[PDB]
Amino acid sequence: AMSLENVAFNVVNKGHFDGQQGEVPVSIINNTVYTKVDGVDVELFENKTTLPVNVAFELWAKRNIKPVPEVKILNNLGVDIAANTVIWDYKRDAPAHISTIGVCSMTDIAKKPTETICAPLTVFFDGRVDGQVDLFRNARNGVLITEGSVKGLQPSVGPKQASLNGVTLIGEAVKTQFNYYKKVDGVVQQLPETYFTQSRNLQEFKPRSQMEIDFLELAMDEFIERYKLEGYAFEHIVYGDFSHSQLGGLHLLIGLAKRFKESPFELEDFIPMDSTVKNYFITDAQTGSSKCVCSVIDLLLDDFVEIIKSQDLSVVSKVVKVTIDYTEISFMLWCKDGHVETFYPKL
Amino acid sequence: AMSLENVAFNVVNKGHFDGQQGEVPVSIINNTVYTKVDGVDVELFENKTTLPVNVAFELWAKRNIKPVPEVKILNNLGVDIAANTVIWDYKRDAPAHISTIGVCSMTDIAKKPTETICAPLTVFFDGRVDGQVDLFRNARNGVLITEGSVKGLQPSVGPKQASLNGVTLIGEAVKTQFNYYKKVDGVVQQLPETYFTQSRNLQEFKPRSQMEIDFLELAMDEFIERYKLEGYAFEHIVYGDFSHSQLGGLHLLIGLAKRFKESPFELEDFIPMDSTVKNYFITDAQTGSSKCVCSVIDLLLDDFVEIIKSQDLSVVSKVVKVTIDYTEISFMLWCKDGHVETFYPKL
Amino acid sequence: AMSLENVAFNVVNKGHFDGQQGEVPVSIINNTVYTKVDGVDVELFENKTTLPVNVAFELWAKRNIKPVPEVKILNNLGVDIAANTVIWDYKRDAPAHISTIGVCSMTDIAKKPTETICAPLTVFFDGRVDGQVDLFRNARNGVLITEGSVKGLQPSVGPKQASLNGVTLIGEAVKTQFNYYKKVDGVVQQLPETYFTQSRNLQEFKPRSQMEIDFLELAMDEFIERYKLEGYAFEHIVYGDFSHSQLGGLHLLIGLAKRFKESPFELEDFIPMDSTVKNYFITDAQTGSSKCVCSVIDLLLDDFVEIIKSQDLSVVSKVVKVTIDYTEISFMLWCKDGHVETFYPKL
Amino acid sequence: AMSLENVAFNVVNKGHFDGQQGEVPVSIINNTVYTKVDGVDVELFENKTTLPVNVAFELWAKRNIKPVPEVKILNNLGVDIAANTVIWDYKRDAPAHISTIGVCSMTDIAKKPTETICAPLTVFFDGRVDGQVDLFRNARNGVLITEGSVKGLQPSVGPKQASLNGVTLIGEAVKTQFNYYKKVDGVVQQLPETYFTQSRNLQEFKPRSQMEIDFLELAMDEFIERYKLEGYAFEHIVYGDFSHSQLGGLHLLIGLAKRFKESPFELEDFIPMDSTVKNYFITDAQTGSSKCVCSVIDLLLDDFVEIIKSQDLSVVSKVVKVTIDYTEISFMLWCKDGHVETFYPKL
Amino acid sequence: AMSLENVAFNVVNKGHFDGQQGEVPVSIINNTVYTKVDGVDVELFENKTTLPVNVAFELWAKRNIKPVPEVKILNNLGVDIAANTVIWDYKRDAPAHISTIGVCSMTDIAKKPTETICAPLTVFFDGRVDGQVDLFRNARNGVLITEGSVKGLQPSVGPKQASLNGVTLIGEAVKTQFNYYKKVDGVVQQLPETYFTQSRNLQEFKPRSQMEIDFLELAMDEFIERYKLEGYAFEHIVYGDFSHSQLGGLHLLIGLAKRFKESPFELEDFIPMDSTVKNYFITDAQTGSSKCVCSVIDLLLDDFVEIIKSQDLSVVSKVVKVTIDYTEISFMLWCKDGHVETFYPKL
């Protein structure tokens, strides 16, 4: 059975819900779950969601603690429901998919896991758990991650990193590299050859390739010179221009770190969630420059150079379709006179 | 085990917690417990207390549905805790005794029912349940009600009336009259001879003796002279005087009903609870007479006459103490020239 | 467009949302919508639902004010969604169907009005509005009510009464009699010859047939004798027995009125909603009799007699399926020695 | 000094704040003030306003309990602030004027009394309290009510009834008849000869003149014939027409009672407050007739006849200025062919 | 007297409640106390407790600002209530002991400071305040801290550090070293010779002895061999092993700092409170290693070596009771073949 006091017991001892037996007093006051440890109330959980507090507490305590794909990957892959587990979105601080089936009943609106309302539901399956590959096979539209490989199916190599307990990481002790399978209309797919966001951030930016180490360390103009990037105008699209109140270009996280190292400033995430492209409210604390909305995307700088290389320069103002995180991101690219005038993900 | 969804199950089927097994979805939103009946949320409970909503829901669903003594009887008898049941104060919409032991743990603050902090608590025992008489025997300070009689103990006859599911009543189908036992320091106290409030209501006042029928029907002065109450000032202490803005008298519910028959007015209960003497805020709609506070007692008119008779009138400004509902209520009785100037429950 | 201030404007002038233009200040504080009429906040709406307050306010202001089928009829007919209007459930004090499509986009979970997610949605169509018959024709599974009659479809006569603004009534000035059509899997249905609840209550019970007037007025035993009901034991199944704490029989609203007239008591609806059978918590204020759960059903007493007449008495303990309000209600009917021992809707 | 525990003390003993000394424990939980009477929390106050709960509790406990003018009178007279007391609006269940000066510093926004920000406020003065006449004299824009009469000022006779503790009444023991004075720009006014709403309701409608008693008792057509007002068409403007879904006319409370006496129906006040004209959502439970908005006004039927008598019939569709409750109410009157086609307060 | 506005005054000027005179406007909105500084509301306090907001505000403003023992010390010493002061638990953001006697009356469940209900309460006395030593003498069960020394009583040296305004510290300017006294059942105790937690953390770990500086600076293996720790397996019980997803050993804060210096990771305190042993949810951001629950204890590394030295190695799987912070903490210690297989505080 599922009870609030048992869930609170598990949380108090383990921090998540295993399924032990034992119960503890629980108090609920205004979107908050307290328990009386040693005669004093301590806050176990605080509902930041739009769900009822007991519902969200029971979803949170049941969250997945093994490494899992980042929620942006599942959004791009169209996942709607997770089978037999809960994916917690530590950005939103709430479950990734509002309904849950194969986990608990009153979270979902679908009648049955394969009912008519629940047919176009793209499920998610965790190969590391037994039987999930089978459930994939018998599924209508589903996405499967597997720790290793499965028979009779072409794999698809995903990102190096995964989210473990809300921190993204590349794991030695843990395999944060899964193989992906997709079956829409019961028919396996051919996942596109795609590009993976590195999922980094300014205050802890770490270069992951020699080009990145050169970018961070080398001076500006001699870096453009050194990697033969003179014709592609990285002084704006990457390096970031501050000569005006309206901050210009600067649509790569690498450039943001390369400037933030000089003088810190702030990023204002007005839509707290996860996506391949992230719109920030950017303000330069040194010069006073600020852009109302700035679309930042975080490729490998190696991969940024590769995609810019593979692109012809003939079209004056072209739109490119590049496959990032299994989704087609469209890049606006005005090329003037055979050089890169502007290049960023179109709003 | 103790489960919120089990409690809601019982409430949905039975309206109270029996102890069946089954669960129903539960949602908590802002001091309110809902459940999904046939796909729609219906509100099971709404917390009017100062307790956490799940705590109060569990206490409410565990309330006693057999006839029970009115809470004023238990307050006067000093009861502090009930054993193995919950008394619901439908006046306050909250349990009668905030702590609860012998039922559940985290409600009470005493460590153990026998522990030192819990020794000086007057417990309440329900004879109709088995074993409770024994528990009363082995109890330090306790009050016991029995439907019939117990061996080796002098009974004490209480009111004919009782609270069944929050409505007070006299029952032939159900025995609403109990025998009372009180033990202080394990020593069986002898209960005083006492008078009982009739717990009647203003809107639905019903005479319970011939004198009351005469009061309601007979004219005023013909009534005072008819029962020979001319020297006892019933025209003020009972009938109530409306000549002035400051309302006078009206300290018996009988007189309030006698006026309310002639014209409705409003009684405002600024302290919603249950007591032997109840202070009301009176506004007379016809005359406009109003008194900020007026103490009302609903003792039997027969027994009111009896107490007024048994009392000498020599003392000008005496204070009587009569035992009502097992507690000493003191009236102020100012007598002038062998008759009663004023007489009411002193504030 | 839809805005909170426009909706509040409409509510302030009309009481519901027509679609006028004009806006008024709005304040939201804790599940409550206020507006500043002449410099003072007046409460426009108070959210009793589990929906966000602005969502529920906009649903309520958009509710249907023409006469509509009672929500129990729509539940029985399986309706899941209403097209182009909102049905307010004044019992629950919340919308009858949580999602809305054909009305508003951010209340439903189905992607489109026509989608695989919304294939099994039994929609509701209001023939009194233009185009709704056509939408019914093109619909997958739908229920249509029509003011008069439609071509090519067998009608189905529904109840005499409808719900107008939350009060149920039979209308002279308004036609509260609709014809019903059901198309599951695209194919028209054959709505069963059914029995209709009269939707009455104790506070204002009014007889609707001569047998009912005899029941209310005539004495008990000579009424059983007069309509030749001696062999069917209406003293229990209808009249209601109070000889014990556990109240017996008494499963018809008419018997409830026939007793409540003698001495009033209370009914506790612990599941506030609408259904053909309603479980009450019943307590006899005179005798002190009380049943924890009592299933009450309100047929026409004429129709009760007819259904009991149609039943053979051979089966000792039979279960009868009778079609009430387009749904199969099953009575348990214990017949001993050719007479009606017990007969009530089985729990 | 003003403290929450002192205020709660006064409320617990008196029901309002006198200014005694003594304090009681107070708890605040979610717009509610509780106090611990004899070990149990009892709810003292529940905030229905948009003010902070302690602010509103301290305003409520300081409300005026002497008879006071109805809030609609003060609105019409333009009162913005009350000096040295609080007017509670029991309709809205909140103070009549949000700010208070001369009472409490942290409720108003004007810096000081008679300040430049405070100059254009019409204050209210209670003659029954000492010094208020003087404060009126020295005031810029003020309205004074006096129990009796004042020297050097023409009085103005107000309504017979006043609001005492939220119930309107004509008082014998209390003088609910005040004389009014208005001084705009420090210049005394000439209050118009006006007509007064009687402030009645359907549940307890009581005729106040012989014509009203005839209206209630007499049949319709012979009542029109009897008082000989056949040309003025009271079958619509007063009696109310019920032959259509859209209810017709029926803009006088007297007519509403004359129907509600026959068969009860429901009034839905969608703007809970006080005004000379009140817009109701009206529905006929018998016929099924219903009007979305109905402006009801409650004169003395004597005075209705008087205003209709003083009316010329030449203008086909005229707008009439009539002084009711010291404010100009406009009646629209389609009077075609010398007869009263339609006549009601224009929306 | 105690009032909300006076308390807010003190807080606004001083930050805590001294007892000055003066009052300031206060607003309460949803577990938050605001005051109007210069015409704008500023938030004074925000209720994180389970107490009523005014109750908690008055407790917080009355908190102790002199250095005080860590709440874990008082928990271990069994303290139930403080006398004449409030200990604030800055971990929980709530008072350390729910009930207060000598502070205010509506905080304690005990009827009196000295009563049968409050006999078994271990009170806390602050010797730095006058009369508290005397109150200790006359006390039933009490714990006293003294700044210096008292006559006729054996002292007991406590920890070097105290909590001043929620930050723990060893004080030069302030004496954070008290002498402890315990009188259970009126008889002075013999406080055990015990070990004291150092109360440090990863973000600001600072070594406090030469052995600790060697630990932080020296690499692993030469540190084990250098302090003769080869046979005691500090590579697991202290250094922490990351070869697997399930992190191993690592039950000393010093080892946590010694690793966190290399690569940072996170600690999730799922039970926010204070205790001698603290269960963390630990995840290695570099290797991906993570343990669901990890009991961390923070001795002086010198004292850890001392306890491991004093312990025999004969028992294969022993449990050691060592007195830390005046309480008996038991380590599980699996010794295999004369070496320390595992050693950590048993869960």
Numbering used by the authors:
A (entry chain E), B (entry chain D), C (entry chain F), D (entry chain B), E (entry chain C): -1 to 345
What does the original paper state about this entry?
The NSP15 endoribonuclease enzyme, known as NendoU, is highly conserved and plays a critical role in the ability of the virus to evade the immune system. NendoU is a three-domain 34 kDa protein that was demonstrated to form a barrel-shaped hexamer in solution by the assembly of two trimers. The oligomerization is mostly driven by the contacts of the N-terminal (ND) and the middle (MD) domains, while the C-terminal domain (CD) carries the canonical catalytic residues from the endonuclease family. In terms of substrate specificity, NendoU of the coronaviruses is described to cleave a great variety of single- and double-stranded RNAs in an Mn2+-dependent reaction, by hydrolyzing the 3′ end of pyrimidines, with a strong preference for uracil, and to release 2′,3′-cyclic phosphate and 5′-hydroxyl ends as products.
During our cryo-EM studies, we were able to elucidate multiple high-quality models of NendoUhex in different pHs and buffers, with resolution ranging from 2.5 to 3.5 Å. Based on our biochemical results, we performed cryo-EM data collection of NendoUhex in buffers where the enzyme showed maximum activity and reduced activity, such as PBS at pH 6.0, Bis-Tris at pH 6.0 (two more active conditions) and HEPES at pH 7.5 (a less active condition), detailed in Supplementary Table S1. For more basic buffers, such as MOPS pH 7.0, HEPES pH 7.5 and Tris pH 8.5, the enzyme activity of both NendoUmon and NendoUhex was virtually negligible. Despite their similarities, models showed consistent differences in the switch region. For samples in HEPES at pH 7.5, we observed that the canonical form of interacting switch regions assumes a more closed and mobile conformation in comparison with known crystal structures. The overall structure of the hexamer is also deeply affected by these distinct conformations of the switch region, where in pH 7.5 we observe a more contracted form of the barrel. In fact, this open–closed form model seems to agree with our biochemical data showing that the enzyme is far more active in acidic than in basic pH, where the switch seems to be found in the closed conformation. A general observation we made was that particles from samples in basic pHs, such as HEPES at pH 7.5, tend to be individual particles, while particles from samples obtained in more acid pHs, such as Bis-Tris at pH 6.0 and PBS at pH 6.0, tend to be arranged side by side, forming filaments, which is a common mechanism of allosteric control of enzyme activity.
